[PDB]
Design a protein around this ligand. Sequence first.
Ligand SMILES: [Zn+2]
Ligand SMILES: [Zn+2]
Lengths: 21, 21, 21, 21, 21, 21, 30, 30, 30, 30, 30, 30
Amino acid sequence: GIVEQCCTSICSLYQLENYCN
Amino acid sequence: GIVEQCCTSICSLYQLENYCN
Amino acid sequence: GIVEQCCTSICSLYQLENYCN
Amino acid sequence: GIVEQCCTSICSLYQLENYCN
Amino acid sequence: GIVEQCCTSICSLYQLENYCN
Amino acid sequence: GIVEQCCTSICSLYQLENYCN
Amino acid sequence: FVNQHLCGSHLVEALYLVCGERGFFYTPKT
Amino acid sequence: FVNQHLCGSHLVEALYLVCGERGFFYTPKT
Amino acid sequence: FVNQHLCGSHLVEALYLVCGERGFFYTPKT
Amino acid sequence: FVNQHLCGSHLVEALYLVCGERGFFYTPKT
Amino acid sequence: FVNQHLCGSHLVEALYLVCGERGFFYTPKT
Amino acid sequence: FVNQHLCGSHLVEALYLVCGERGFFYTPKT
Ligand SMILES: [Zn+2]
Ligand SMILES: [Zn+2]
C-alpha cells in the first residue's frame, strides 16, 4: 500500500491521512 | 515566531500552514 | 510501552527486538 | 538555484555558503 | 569498504558490527 | 572532546573543523 | 539495488507527523 | 514542554532498522 | 544549554513538508 | 519518478547547518 | 549524478547505532 | 535521563558534513 503507491511516486497529505489510525 | 511559539510547545499543522509562502 | 520504557531511558537492541512483528 | 545546481550534483560548503542570509 | 560493499547493496547488522571499534 | 565540549553547548563550524581528518 | 530500505524510511517521517497525536502501523508485505 | 514529539521520533528510526525486512506498529496510548 | 540549535532543526523538517511543492523562509531573529 | 521531493530534503539539512546561527530561505521555483 | 553523498549519510546513522556505547571511524578513500 | 544518546547523534550529522569529501572519527570515551 504505502510501500508502492507512495514509494514509486510522491503522494498528498490527504492520501497519507487515510492510513491514519 | 516559529523559533518560540512552536519551539517551546508543539503546534498544529494548521498553524504551521500559516507560515507557508 | 516504547513511549515511556525507552522514551525515558535508552534501551538495548535486544529489548527493541521484542517489539518486532 | 539550489534545486538544480546542487540537486543534480553535490556542491561544496563554499558554494552553499553563498546562499546564507 | 563501507562506501561500496554496503553503499551498493544493503548489508546485515552482523557485517556492520565488524566495523565497530 | 565532542561528547562534552559541544554536547553541553553548541559550537562553531571552525571548532568542528579542527576534528576533521 | 538499494532504494526500498531508504524509500520506506522517508515515508515513516511523513507518516506519524500527518496523524499528529495519533499513531499508525507499518507492515511492508503483500 | 516539548520532548515527547521528539522522543517518539528518535525511536522510529531505531525501530524499523532493528526488525530489518520486517515491519512494526507504533501507537502511543494507554 | 543546547536546545535552540536542535529545536530549530526539528521544525525545518516539519516546515517544507507542510507546504509541499511550495517553499518557505526561516530566519530566527527579533 | 520520485527524486525531487527527496533531493530537496537532503539539502535543507546541509543548508541551515552551513549558515550556523543565521537562517536562510528555500523556494523551489523558476 | 548525486548518490554517494547521500549513500554515505544513510550508513552513518546505522553505524554508531550498531556499536552502541562504542564509537567508530568513517573514511571514504582507496 | 536520556540526552547523551541524542546529543551524540545531533553532532554526527554536523560532523561529516563539515569535513565534506573527507571523513572523521567518533569515539565517546575518556
Ligand atoms: Zn535519503
Ligand atoms: Zn532530536
